[PDB]
C-alpha cells in the first residue's frame, strides 16, 4: 500500500500444439497485499503442465505452461490491485477429437 502502477500488461500469445506459453507482466509494486490470477475457470497452479513462478520479489510475474492442447484456448486474466491486465490465448491443434483424458 505505497505504490502500484502497471507498466506493461499481458499480450497475445501464439504457440503451436505441444508447445509452451510465457506471459511476462512488469509492474511497479515491490509489495504483495492482494493478488488473484484466474485464466480459465481453474486456479492457475496445478503442476508442471501449468504453474506460476516469479522473481524480483513479484516485480516480474512469469507463467509457464506446456503440452498446449487446442482446448487450452481460453482467457488469461490477472488482477493485481487497481491494475488489470488481460490477453487472449491462441494455440493451434490437429485432431478434431480426442478420447484421452477429456
UniProtKB/Swiss-Prot annotation:
Portion of the full sequence shown: 4337 to 4429 of 7968
Classification lineage: Eukaryota, Metazoa, Chordata, Craniata, Vertebrata
Function statement: Structural component of striated muscles which plays a role in myofibrillogenesis. Probably involved in the assembly of myosin into sarcomeric A bands in striated muscle. Has serine/threonine protein kinase activity and phosphorylates N-cadherin CDH2 and sodium/potassium-transporting ATPase subunit ATP1B1.
Family in the record: Belongs to the protein kinase superfamily. CAMK Ser/Thr protein kinase family.
Assembly: Interacts (via protein kinase domain 2) with CDH2 and (via protein kinase domain 1) with ATP1B1. Isoform 3 interacts with TTN/titin and calmodulin. Isoform 3 interacts with ANK1 isoform Mu17/ank1.5.
Involvement in disorder: Rhabdomyolysis 1: An autosomal recessive disorder characterized by severe and recurrent rhabdomyolysis, usually with onset in the teenage years. Some of the episodes may be triggered by exercise or heat; others occur spontaneously. Rhabdomyolysis is the rapid breakdown of damaged or injured skeletal myofibres and may require intensive care management. Muscle breakdown results in release of myofibrillar content into the extracellular space and circulation, resulting in hyperCKemia (hyperCK) and myoglobinuria.
Subcellular location: Cytoplasm, Myofibril, Sarcomere, M line; Cytoplasm, Myofibril, Sarcomere, Z line; Cell membrane, Sarcolemma; Nucleus
Source species of the chain: Homo sapiens (Human)
Protein's recorded name: Obscurin
Top-level taxonomic group: Eukaryota
PTM entry text: Autophosphorylated by protein kinase domains 1 and 2.
Amino acid at each position: 500500500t505505497a505504490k502500484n502502477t502497471v507498466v506493461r500488461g499481458l499480450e497475445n500469445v501464439e504457440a503451436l500444439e505441444g508447445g509452451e506459453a510465457l506471459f511476462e507482466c512488469q509492474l511497479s509494486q515491490p509489495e504483495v497485499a492482494a493478488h488473484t490470477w484466474l485464466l480459465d475457470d481453474e486456479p492457475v497452479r496445478t503442476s508442471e503442465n501449468a504453474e506460476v513462478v516469479f522473481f524480483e520479489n513479484g516485480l516480474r510475474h512469469l507463467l509457464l505452461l506446456k503440452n498446449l492442447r487446442p482446448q487450452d484456448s481460453c482467457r488469461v486474466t490477472f488482477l493485481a490491485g487497481d491494475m488489470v491486465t488481460s490477453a487472449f490465448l491462441t494455440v493451434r491443434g490437429g485432431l478434431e477429437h480426442h478420447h484421452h483424458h477429456h
